[PDB]
């Protein structure tokens with residue numbers, strides 16, 4: 001599970017920094033949660049958890065629920081946050097974040 005890939009302490013702090021609606025900053029969240037300490041293969045393992053339905057893509061529903069993929073206590077993303085995150089991650093413009101797109105988003109954080 002996520003707390004086997006990332007530390008629960010780091011997840012707690014990361015989620016806790018973004019409790020207010022509209023606060024989410026993907027670069028800062030990825031830093032805080034420990035994604036900037038992970039190998040390329042472990043970044044992909046995190047993706048696969050976030051891809052809740054195992055389609056190979058983080059669709060809009062899974063994107064709005066992204067924080068819940070890290071902690072089930074978390075809020076849904078706000079509308080502003082989902083729009084800016086999708087735009088940041090969806091480089092090919094198809095409305096979803098795929099494997100490489102997620103890896104790139106993390107690498108650049």
Ligand SMILES: [Ca+2]
Pocket residue numbers: 051052053054055056057058059062
């Ligand atoms: Ca999916």
Ligand SMILES: [Ca+2]
Pocket residue numbers: 089090091092093094095096097098101
């Ligand atoms: Ca895409």
